[PDB]
């Protein structure tokens, strides 16, 4: 059909001619590679589709128009906005109660698209009262009463209500949605678990208050389990959620450790996927940023050698994260812990990254070495450590930095040269 033929049909007072045109429009919007969304908007059809959502009598045209509008709302912000301006949100929310499951579904989907656009339309969908009727659909006794296609859409739309910052989702909305997300995180469908993990990913990406909310529900254990799933779509978000939680307080970080996250991290730190390695090493760095007893659990779960090898073998983005992990460790750790780091052969692969062209990272490594030297001083083993650094070719790279553009680099490298180059309570 032409867009003209669709308009002529929709404008007909004949209810069957309207359905036929809306079918034709649903096809243009779904089957086409380059859909004529802008043509349909300009033809002034959005308001008519939106009122077809209200046609209880003819549930076919409720469904067909819900599809059409889904796909229009799936475009650019201009196109989504066009649908919202056409009054679509409260009409979709009304359809959530539809006794026809597949129409409810399409409304769940449509609302998901709108909420996905950003913080504005997210907050708006909530304002129109989308939460109560959405959670009500997952309020059944047994989750497996719902078809898996219908359930994935609900979980996805729910994740979009948890998404974005500036501002974050309203607290009242998060408090209400979380109990359902806990229940969803124990479902055995991979796609649902990925969607749920994404939701919790977004909720933990904020200040400690928001993290506290997630932690109190008791989901950290179950996330740690999902950390070691086969399905990479589950691991990626689950790891990001865990990473976000350890950005919080020492007590919040401990929940993660207490939940046995450190057992799974060897496979994360050596994952086939670059992205998982980075994120794992980033997560590690935030734990080596913590209390000395937390550093000791990193040591106890045998992870230090894994960080040492990530620092050697990984791509640069990941190596940067290892630099941070190692330096945080040297900053917070006891002399005993630093000795152990040296024994795992940190010195060389760390100092190798001094030839990196990243002024920030260079300063972080020189700090690490400064910290290690202070541990050495307390043992009276600055000579031994000097000689180990010379043997790792690290002295050549420190005095190489005395011809660097940066002044912090120049003076930090100088102070090391001047100062130091002129049981586990020894570096042997």
């Amino acid at each position: 059909w032409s867009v003209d033929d669709i308009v002529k049909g929709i404008n007909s007072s004949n209810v069957e001619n309207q359905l036929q045109a809306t079918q034709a429009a649903r096809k243009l919007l779904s089957r086409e590679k380059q859909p004529p969304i802008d043509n349909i908007i300009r033809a002034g059809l959005i308001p008519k589709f939106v009122s077809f959502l209200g046609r209880t009598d003819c549930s076919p045209i409720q469904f067909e128009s819900a599809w059409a509008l889904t796909n229009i709302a799936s475009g650019t912000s201009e196109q989504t906005k066009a649908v919202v301006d056409g009054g679509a949100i409260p009409a979709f929310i009304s359809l959530l109660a539809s006794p026809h499951a597949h129409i409810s579904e399409q409304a769940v989907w449509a609302l998901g698209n709108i909420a996905g656009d950003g913080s504005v339309f997210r907050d708006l969908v909530i304002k129109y009262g989308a939460v109560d009727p959405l959670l009500a659909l997952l309020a059944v006794p047994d989750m497996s009463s719902l078809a898996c296609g219908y359930l994935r859409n609900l979980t996805w739309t729910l994740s979009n209500l948890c998404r974005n910052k500036n501002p974050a989702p309203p607290i009242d909305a998060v408090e209400q949605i979380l109990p359902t997300l806990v229940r969803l995180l124990h479902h055995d469908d991979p796609e649902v678990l990925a969607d749920t993990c994404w939701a919790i990913s977004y909720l933990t990406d904020g200040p400690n208050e928001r993290i506290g909310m997630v932690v109190k529900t008791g989901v950290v254990p179950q996330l740690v389990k999902l950390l070691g799933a086969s399905e990479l779509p589950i691991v990626t978000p689950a790891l990001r959620a865990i990473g976000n939680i350890v950005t919080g307080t020492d007590e919040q970080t401990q929940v993660v450790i207490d939940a046995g996250a450190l057992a799974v991290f060897p496979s994360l730190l050596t994952n086939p996927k670059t992205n998982i390695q980075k994120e794992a090493t980033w997560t590690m760095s935030n734990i080596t940023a913590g209390r000395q007893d937390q550093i000791q659990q990193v040591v106890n779960h045998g992870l230090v050698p894994f960080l040492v090898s990530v620092l050697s073998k990984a791509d640069f983005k990941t190596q940067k994260e290892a630099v941070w992990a190692v330096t945080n460790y040297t900053s917070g750790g006891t002399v005993e812990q630093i000795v152990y780091l040296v024994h795992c052969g940190i010195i060389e692969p760390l100092m190798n990254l001094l030839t990196a062209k990243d002024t920030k990272i260079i300063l972080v490594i020189l700090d690490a070495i400064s910290n290690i030297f202070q541990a050495a001083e307390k043992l009276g083993e600055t000579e031994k450590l000097s000689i180990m650094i010379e043997e790792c070719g690290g002295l050549d790279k420190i005095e190489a930095l005395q011809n660097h553009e940066n002044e912090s680099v120049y003076k930090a490298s100088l102070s090391l040269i001047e100062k130091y180059f002129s049981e586990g309570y020894t570096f042997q």
């Binding site: 919007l29 779904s30 475009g75 978000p237 760095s285 935030n286």
Partner: peptide, 20 residues
């Protein structure tokens, strides 16, 4: 040397989906 927040995410879930 304290806690550091995340970069941007490389592999993002869909914002919007069309039904095809």
């Amino acid at each position: 040397f304290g806690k550091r927040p995340a970069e941007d995410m490389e592999e993002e879930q869909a914002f919007k989906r069309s039904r095809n």
